[PDB]
Amino acid sequence: WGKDHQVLRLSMENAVGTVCHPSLMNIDAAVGGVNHDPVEAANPYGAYV
Amino acid sequence: YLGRGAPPLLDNAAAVYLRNAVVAGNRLGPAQPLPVFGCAQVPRRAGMD
Amino acid sequence: HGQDAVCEFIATPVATDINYFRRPCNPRGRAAGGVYAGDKEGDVIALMYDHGQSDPARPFAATANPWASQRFSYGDLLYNGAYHLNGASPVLSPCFKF
C-alpha cells in the first residue's frame, strides 16, 4: 500500500532498468582487487583446459 | 542510465539498443544526450498527486 | 423514488484492473485536474492529454483507459464541449464535466 487504498505492484519487469545496465559485466575491480592474499593451487581439475 | 561510471558495451550497435529500450518512457529517463559536464536533468511530468 | 438519475456509459478495455475503481478515480482514466498543475505555461493540457508522461494519480502506468483519456479518443469525441454530440438533448450529461 502507498498513501491510500492504492495497491502498488513491483513486478520484476520493473527491474529492467536496474540490472540490464552494462555495469553488470564490469568486474575488473572485483577479480583484480580481490586477487591479493594469494591462496595456493588446491589441485584444480576443471579450471584447466 | 542517469549516471555513468562504468564502461559501456563494446558493440555500440548493441549499446544503443540496450539504452533506448529502457530510457524511452521512464519517469527517470534522461534527456536527449547526457552532458559531458552537467547533469541528466530528469525531465518533469506536468503533475503529481 | 425521486429524481431520475442519468447513467452514462464509457467504453473501457476489459483488461483494466478492478483495483482501479476501488478508490476515488477518474472515469476518463487520466487524472486531469488543474489542482495537479505545476505552474508551467501550458502544463494542464499536457497534464490531461500527453501520454509520454504518466498519470499523477497512478504514476506507473500512463492511462487506465486509452479510449477515454486521450485527445480524439472515443471518450473525448462523445463528451467534450467542443464536439457536442449530446448538445441538443436537454437530458444532463454527467460526463460533460469530465
Report yes or no: C76 and C35 within 8 Å, Cβ to Cβ: no
Cβ neighbours around C51 below 10 Å, total: 15
Experimentally, the structure was elucidated by cryo-EM
With CA atoms as reference, report the closest residue to C60 among B25, A16, B21, B18.
B25
In the block, cell 533506448 appears at B20
The residue type found at C64 is A
With CA atoms as reference, report the closest residue to C32 among C44, C21, C20.
C44
Distance CA B22, CA B2 (A): 11
Identify which of C31, C38, C44 has the shortest CB distance to residue B44: C38
Cβ neighbours around B41 below 10 Å, total: 12
Q: Does A18 touch chain B (CB under 8 A)?
A: no
Query: What does the DSSP 8-state code read for residue A47?
Result: T
Report CA-CA distances (Å) from B39 to B2, B3, B20, B26, B42.
Answer: 8, 8, 18, 17, 8
Q: Does B34 touch chain A (CB under 8 A)?
A: no
Sign of CA dihedral C49, C45, C59, C7: negative
- Chain A residue with CA closest to C18: the answer is A7
Backbone angles phi, psi at A2, to 5 degrees: -85, -145
